Amino acid sequence: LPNYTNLDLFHRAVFPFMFLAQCVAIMPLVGIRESNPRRVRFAYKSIPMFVTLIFMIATSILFLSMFTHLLKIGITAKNFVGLVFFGCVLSAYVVFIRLAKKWPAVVRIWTRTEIPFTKPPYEIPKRNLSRRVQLAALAIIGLSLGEHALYQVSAILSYTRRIQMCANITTVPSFNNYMQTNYDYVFQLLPYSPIIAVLILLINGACTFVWNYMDLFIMMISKGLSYRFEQITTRIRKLEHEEVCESVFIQIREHYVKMCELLEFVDSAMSSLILLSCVNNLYFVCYQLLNVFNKLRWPINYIYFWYSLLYLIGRTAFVFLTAADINEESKRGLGVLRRVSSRSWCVEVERLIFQMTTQTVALSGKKFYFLTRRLLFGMAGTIVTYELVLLQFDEPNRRKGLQPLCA
Amino acid sequence: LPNYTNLDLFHRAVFPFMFLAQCVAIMPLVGIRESNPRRVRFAYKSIPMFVTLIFMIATSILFLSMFTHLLKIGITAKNFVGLVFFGCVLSAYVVFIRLAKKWPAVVRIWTRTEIPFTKPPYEIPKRNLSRRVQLAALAIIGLSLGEHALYQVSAILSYTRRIQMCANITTVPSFNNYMQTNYDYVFQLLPYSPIIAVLILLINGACTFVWNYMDLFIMMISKGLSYRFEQITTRIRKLEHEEVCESVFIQIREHYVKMCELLEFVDSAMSSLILLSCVNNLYFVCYQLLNVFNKLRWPINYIYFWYSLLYLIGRTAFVFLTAADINEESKRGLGVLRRVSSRSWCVEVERLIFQMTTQTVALSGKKFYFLTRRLLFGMAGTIVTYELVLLQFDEPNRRKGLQPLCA
Amino acid sequence: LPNYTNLDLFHRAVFPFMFLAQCVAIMPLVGIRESNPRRVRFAYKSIPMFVTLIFMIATSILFLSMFTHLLKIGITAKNFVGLVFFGCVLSAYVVFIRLAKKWPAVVRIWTRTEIPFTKPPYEIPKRNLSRRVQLAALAIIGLSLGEHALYQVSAILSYTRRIQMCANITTVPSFNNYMQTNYDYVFQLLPYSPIIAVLILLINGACTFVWNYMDLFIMMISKGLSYRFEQITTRIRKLEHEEVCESVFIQIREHYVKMCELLEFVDSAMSSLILLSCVNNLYFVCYQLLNVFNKLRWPINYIYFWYSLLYLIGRTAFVFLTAADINEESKRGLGVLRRVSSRSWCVEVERLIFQMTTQTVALSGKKFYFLTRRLLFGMAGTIVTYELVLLQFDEPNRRKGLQPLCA
Amino acid sequence: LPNYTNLDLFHRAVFPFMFLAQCVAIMPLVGIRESNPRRVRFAYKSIPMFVTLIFMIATSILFLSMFTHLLKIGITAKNFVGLVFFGCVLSAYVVFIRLAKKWPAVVRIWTRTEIPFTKPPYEIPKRNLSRRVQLAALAIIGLSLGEHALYQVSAILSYTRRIQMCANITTVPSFNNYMQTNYDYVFQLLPYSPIIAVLILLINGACTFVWNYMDLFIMMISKGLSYRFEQITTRIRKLEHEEVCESVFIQIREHYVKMCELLEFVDSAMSSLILLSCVNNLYFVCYQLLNVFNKLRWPINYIYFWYSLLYLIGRTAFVFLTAADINEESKRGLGVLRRVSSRSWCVEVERLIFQMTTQTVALSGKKFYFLTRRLLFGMAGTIVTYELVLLQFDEPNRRKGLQPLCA
């Protein structure tokens, strides 16, 4: 059997971040850190499942608290966003549980499909799969950490400045008062306690990490698939000015078909996650874009709002772009194959060219759409239209202006 | 001739529900319950035609009553919905009459096309055609029955509670007063009578059943076609790792072409019904989605409204999905055919792959559109845009709020 | 040379209505009524060109009168429509002049391309080209005549009823007063005279006839092309269950390619007319649909408005449908060709199937779009969206209501 | 080596206007005027780079001045346009710098790809590449010069007429007062000086020239590519009625594949410029179309506004059309290739036809869209929808009307 310890495989590249997500109980798989992907199993009676259950219970407590708070103060389009966030987090938990159910088989087939690409005539690119996945994951994690830090900083600064510059009722600033004020939706349903406060903060951070990790996981999977597609494209490029025997084309076509089968399997496994991520990101992007013209009090509030908006837009765009890189790389080999000489031309090249040309090699949201650059441009246009229609809805709220600091 | 009594055929699977619809006079065909589909005939001078005429007369009476009531009280976008409902029911009646005119030939060709799939190398799946059609029909019928029961319960509860908690003019609750109040649009044109009341209730139930049965019939037809397409896909799958003779591919291609011809014939027969169902469902989905933010008095009213909205959305989505299952199953065999070895590759496989790849195997609304997952996603986007644009229209009505119970 | 007197050719079918349009000076061609299409020539120094110049001068006088009237009374979206109408008529005149410039060559190639289809193995359908063109032209002409008669009847009835039921300033009804009132935009710039009145009425009728004849001409051309495409489809159908020699497929492919070349030539010649008709019909359909909810005084006004709206919608839809019949008929032969046996299969059938499948055989508006059923459905959706967005614009005008009859 | 002095090459056709743009420091390339394209190099330490840096510094000064002026007077959708203009100019500068970085290799490959087309069997069309590029560049430059002259004339006339017909505070007209009034956004941040005034005027002219030159450069590149594609189409046309040897088809296919490779390279180099031009033109077209109904004081203001709007719309449309001419010319050869006789038919013709039919030969905005006539029609529809949605936004501003001349 192949030596998984040092081989450039998708599992070896992705399992560190899979375990990091397991720490906040996203994808409860047993033995995810094992070098051999065959040892990855899904078990309900396991520590990851227990941590996942605890996290869903906490997120459901938060969701119920938000729901009751909104019901007491009424539900408006602006407040609903928080409830939507919590609901999406819960949905992501469930989706990831199902994905873990499907993940052993997926990773097994992935390994048995990517072994041929670990040996010649395929070559490791300048940036290996592990490095690409590491860069993407570090970028997303650091950006999310900065977003959460800016959120906390802006909230704390607004609270302290409101209390200090009020020239009215003081309520001397404190951690307990901050928790009871900014997170009143929680303690209105549960009795306050500092331990509960720390738990609420940690679970909110976990919810944010889950929200970002859906997109990050999609990015890593797309990177893994486009890695092998780019390897195929490079191997084809190596035959640009050579007379190619039919066996070479047979092997190339077989490997391409195997990669397409793996892509179909992964798409079937990940369709629910792709759908949830796309719809949630679209909704949140529209909601935040509707608030660009809104007036905020402190410069830190503007900084946080614009950082969050730009990071959300970039994360959605890069999810779509990494997914569409599969399609672009699949199509890139067509240009090289079209240069095949008449002497090297045969039935296998015709089959491969027809498949590349007519088959849409791309991830899909339950086949309700395919993640391509066409889809990203269409999404941008749809967002523009929705924002144009909705800014008229938001005009009355926009003209309300900033509320008095004392009030 | 083949023994139709125990053979797994579409007619044997669908005729029970065709007869059930005939009971409310939807599709007036003679001998629909006969095991031999060749005995199914359409005759104007027949009992089903007479019951159909009676039902269209009753529905036209209801339509005229609604029209006169709206004219007396003025036509608004909110009231127009009822008139639209009645008109759609009448249109469905006419469409189904034409479909019955076309149905003998259709079923005949269907039978003569599906006989090859009843014998090897084709195998009956885990869920046979009869079971799939039964599950779909039972689900739709039960959901529609629950919707109508919730409608009646909510209306009766609202009427009784309005009369009781009025602290004003009483008009002691009774069946006659309920009929004269909730269905005042009828008795304003015809003299009241309890027999007329029972007739009105029965005809309203029949109209609801027709509205649901258009979608149900589309679902059953799509199930029947996708059944044979899935049989073809499974037979192809059985040759994944075998050297296939040219005769096998010839037979597969011939059966696929015959199934495509049957699909074209059925689409030509059912294009009007598909168009009517799609347009009616789109209009009603938009209308009901426009009322999600409206305020209702009793929790039973909310329960009925949300049950009806969710059932309508799910029924439209599942009609589109069952229709698109034909396209998905037709495309599913392409992945297996692409794995055909170079030794088994021949002209027949090339022809079949080209046809699968370039031919859009899907039901269509008079070719004005094709029922695919692409079409369902586009429909969802169009509904979102229409609702965004229309909620501004509905804002003045939304802010009116609940009327006084006494008034 | 072939005997054009009794041959079933497009020129013989269309020249009567071409001459009828020439009577109002639409397409100024010399010798359009000659049996031999080679005798059709375009000459600036000809009687048709003189009548065309006279008609453009009259239409320009009307356009200037409308422009000055609107400038004196201000330009609003509701009045602009008349100016747009006149401008479109002038544009149609110019376009048709250019089309006549291109029409000799077009008709020549058409004849030299349709001669093969006048002899076996091609057969004349049940409805020959002349009968189809006659039916379409008679339908359009009669509907336009009824529309204009209803317009005049409604205007005269409104004028007479306003004068009679005023109980105020009388201005006893007369032809001169009616002309000065309803067509005040003309006589405000030119001195009144009964001869001028008759000229204005005749030129308005001519403008309406031109507006309808653009669509009618598109319909006749689409009928002519789809006639030969249907002949090809029928010839292919005749080989469903026969072993076909390669020469038959060679001839079929050659004739199909020649028909495609003729379609490309006709599309190049008629692209400007198609674009103008599409844009004008879209604008007018949107404008009239915006007025469905407007309140009119007399039932005759409602009758005229709804007749005009329904006729406009049906004319646009049937233009698109007749144009798309070319594409549908081109695609219809694919189903038959796919049934070709393995023994009769050859390179020619593969070429023909690939061309049918991948070539979009359809008329186009300068290739800015292709007239297909897809395009008609998209146009309907776009009109729905535009009307939804514009009814909010029209709400203030809609709520104004009917003006006082006396005022 | 080939004699570049008199050869009909893209570099010889385009370098005069490249140098003209270099005069305002758009594309800083060294030796752009050399006959040999191999001598074109990009160097940071060069005079063009220094002039480019000076121009970006001046444009950044203008951008900061506009930003500070808007911040002092508040930012509104109407004023933001100027800031957007300046930002777009800066972005264009950066993009063109990167394009120059990529331009040596691009032009080298272009030359080595277009040498075969300078010799038989390829023929120079009636209008050579140099003449086409000259016509396009002269048209764009003259239209932009007229637009700027009309802008200056309208501004000066409005200023002088406001001062003269005020019957109030005079501020006798002068160049200094005009500069301080119309360009108050600049001198509010920098001290006034006539030299600074001349510099501001020159830099504004340079910004306008850059804005137009992005589109002009796209047009010239599209002309260059469509030139060779049209040469290929003409060569194919020359074989319409001849028996063609396989070697001729091999050469045609090889040249077509080389042209497609060159198009892909140029698209990769120019994707950023295409994206920027498309988005900027869309935004400005929408903004100016939103102001068609606005009321202007003097007829010269209307003349300038409508000249600018029509020129902008035509420039965008012609950019899209020149880019799509590549696709249209690539597709034009398919009709001729489909007429190839059965005896001349071979594998090479099949390959070429499949490539032409299934490959989208067109420029693209980073593959986020392809510049086709389909894309132009979609852009027109999107602009119509956006304007319909936005005119409701602009209604309050439209009804404000012209401000008092004195105020």
Side-chain angles (χ1 to χ4, degrees), chain B residues 113-128:
Chain B
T113 293
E114 78 190 317
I115 288 287
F117 304 94
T118 58
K119 44 196 68 160
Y122 300 103
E123 52 77 71
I124 292 166
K126 162 254 172 292
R127 200 169 280 151
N128 64 18

Short mmCIF file of all heavy atoms in Angstrom, two decimals, chain B residues 113-128:
data_model
loop_
_atom_site.label_atom_id
_atom_site.label_comp_id
_atom_site.label_asym_id
_atom_site.label_seq_id
_atom_site.Cartn_x
_atom_site.Cartn_y
_atom_site.Cartn_z
N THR B 113 -43.85 1.11 -26.05
CA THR B 113 -42.47 1.54 -25.88
C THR B 113 -41.86 0.99 -24.60
O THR B 113 -40.64 0.81 -24.54
CB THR B 113 -42.40 3.07 -25.88
OG1 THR B 113 -42.75 3.57 -27.17
CG2 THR B 113 -40.99 3.54 -25.53
N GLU B 114 -42.68 0.71 -23.59
CA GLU B 114 -42.18 0.26 -22.30
C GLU B 114 -42.17 -1.26 -22.15
O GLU B 114 -41.70 -1.77 -21.13
CB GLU B 114 -42.99 0.89 -21.17
CG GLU B 114 -44.34 0.25 -20.93
CD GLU B 114 -45.20 1.05 -19.97
OE1 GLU B 114 -44.67 1.53 -18.94
OE2 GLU B 114 -46.41 1.21 -20.24
N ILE B 115 -42.69 -1.99 -23.14
CA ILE B 115 -42.63 -3.46 -23.08
C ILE B 115 -41.20 -3.95 -23.06
O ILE B 115 -40.88 -4.85 -22.26
CB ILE B 115 -43.46 -4.07 -24.22
CG1 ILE B 115 -44.96 -3.88 -23.96
CG2 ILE B 115 -43.12 -5.54 -24.40
CD1 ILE B 115 -45.52 -4.77 -22.86
N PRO B 116 -40.28 -3.44 -23.88
CA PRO B 116 -38.89 -3.94 -23.82
C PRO B 116 -38.27 -3.82 -22.45
O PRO B 116 -37.46 -4.67 -22.07
CB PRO B 116 -38.16 -3.06 -24.85
CG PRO B 116 -39.21 -2.64 -25.81
CD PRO B 116 -40.49 -2.54 -25.03
N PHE B 117 -38.61 -2.78 -21.69
CA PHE B 117 -38.03 -2.57 -20.37
C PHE B 117 -38.61 -3.50 -19.31
O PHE B 117 -38.08 -3.54 -18.19
CB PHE B 117 -38.21 -1.12 -19.94
CG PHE B 117 -37.66 -0.12 -20.92
CD1 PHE B 117 -38.47 0.43 -21.90
CD2 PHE B 117 -36.33 0.25 -20.87
CE1 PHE B 117 -37.96 1.34 -22.80
CE2 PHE B 117 -35.82 1.16 -21.77
CZ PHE B 117 -36.63 1.71 -22.74
N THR B 118 -39.67 -4.23 -19.62
CA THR B 118 -40.25 -5.19 -18.68
C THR B 118 -39.57 -6.55 -18.74
O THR B 118 -39.95 -7.45 -17.98
CB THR B 118 -41.75 -5.36 -18.96
OG1 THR B 118 -41.94 -5.80 -20.32
CG2 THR B 118 -42.49 -4.06 -18.74
N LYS B 119 -38.59 -6.72 -19.61
CA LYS B 119 -37.86 -7.97 -19.79
C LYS B 119 -36.37 -7.69 -19.70
O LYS B 119 -35.93 -6.55 -19.90
CB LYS B 119 -38.20 -8.62 -21.13
CG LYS B 119 -38.24 -7.66 -22.32
CD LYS B 119 -38.94 -8.27 -23.52
CE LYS B 119 -40.43 -8.47 -23.27
NZ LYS B 119 -41.19 -8.61 -24.54
N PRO B 120 -35.56 -8.70 -19.41
CA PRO B 120 -34.11 -8.49 -19.30
C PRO B 120 -33.55 -7.89 -20.57
O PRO B 120 -34.16 -8.00 -21.64
CB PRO B 120 -33.56 -9.90 -19.05
CG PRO B 120 -34.67 -10.84 -19.37
CD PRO B 120 -35.93 -10.10 -19.10
N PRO B 121 -32.38 -7.24 -20.50
CA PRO B 121 -31.50 -7.10 -19.33
C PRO B 121 -31.93 -6.00 -18.37
O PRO B 121 -31.19 -5.62 -17.48
CB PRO B 121 -30.14 -6.79 -19.97
CG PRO B 121 -30.50 -6.01 -21.21
CD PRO B 121 -31.82 -6.57 -21.68
N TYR B 122 -33.14 -5.46 -18.54
CA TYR B 122 -33.66 -4.43 -17.66
C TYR B 122 -34.28 -5.07 -16.42
O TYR B 122 -34.96 -6.10 -16.50
CB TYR B 122 -34.70 -3.58 -18.39
CG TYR B 122 -34.15 -2.87 -19.60
CD1 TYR B 122 -34.42 -3.33 -20.88
CD2 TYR B 122 -33.34 -1.75 -19.46
CE1 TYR B 122 -33.91 -2.68 -21.99
CE2 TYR B 122 -32.83 -1.10 -20.57
CZ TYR B 122 -33.12 -1.57 -21.83
OH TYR B 122 -32.61 -0.92 -22.93
N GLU B 123 -34.04 -4.45 -15.27
CA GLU B 123 -34.48 -4.96 -13.98
C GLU B 123 -35.38 -3.95 -13.29
O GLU B 123 -35.22 -2.73 -13.45
CB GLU B 123 -33.29 -5.31 -13.07
CG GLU B 123 -32.26 -4.19 -12.90
CD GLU B 123 -32.72 -3.11 -11.93
OE1 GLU B 123 -32.77 -3.39 -10.71
OE2 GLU B 123 -33.01 -1.99 -12.38
N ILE B 124 -36.34 -4.46 -12.53
CA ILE B 124 -37.25 -3.60 -11.76
C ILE B 124 -36.49 -3.02 -10.57
O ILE B 124 -35.87 -3.78 -9.81
CB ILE B 124 -38.47 -4.39 -11.31
CG1 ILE B 124 -39.33 -4.77 -12.51
CG2 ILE B 124 -39.28 -3.58 -10.31
CD1 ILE B 124 -40.37 -5.83 -12.22
N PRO B 125 -36.50 -1.69 -10.37
CA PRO B 125 -35.76 -1.13 -9.23
C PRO B 125 -36.35 -1.54 -7.89
O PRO B 125 -37.34 -2.27 -7.84
CB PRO B 125 -35.87 0.39 -9.45
CG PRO B 125 -36.36 0.57 -10.84
CD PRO B 125 -37.15 -0.64 -11.17
N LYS B 126 -35.75 -1.05 -6.80
CA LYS B 126 -36.27 -1.37 -5.48
C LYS B 126 -37.71 -0.87 -5.33
O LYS B 126 -38.57 -1.59 -4.81
CB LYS B 126 -35.36 -0.75 -4.41
CG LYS B 126 -35.98 -0.61 -3.02
CD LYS B 126 -36.33 0.84 -2.72
CE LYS B 126 -37.13 0.97 -1.44
NZ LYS B 126 -38.50 0.40 -1.56
N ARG B 127 -37.98 0.35 -5.77
CA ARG B 127 -39.33 0.91 -5.78
C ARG B 127 -39.85 0.86 -7.21
O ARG B 127 -39.34 1.54 -8.09
CB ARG B 127 -39.32 2.34 -5.25
CG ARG B 127 -40.68 2.83 -4.77
CD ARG B 127 -40.56 4.14 -4.01
NE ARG B 127 -40.12 3.95 -2.63
CZ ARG B 127 -39.42 4.84 -1.93
NH1 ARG B 127 -39.07 6.01 -2.45
NH2 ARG B 127 -39.07 4.55 -0.69
N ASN B 128 -40.88 0.04 -7.43
CA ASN B 128 -41.44 -0.10 -8.77
C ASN B 128 -42.27 1.13 -9.13
O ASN B 128 -42.56 1.99 -8.29
CB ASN B 128 -42.28 -1.37 -8.86
CG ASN B 128 -43.50 -1.35 -7.95
OD1 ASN B 128 -43.92 -0.30 -7.48
ND2 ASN B 128 -44.06 -2.53 -7.70
#
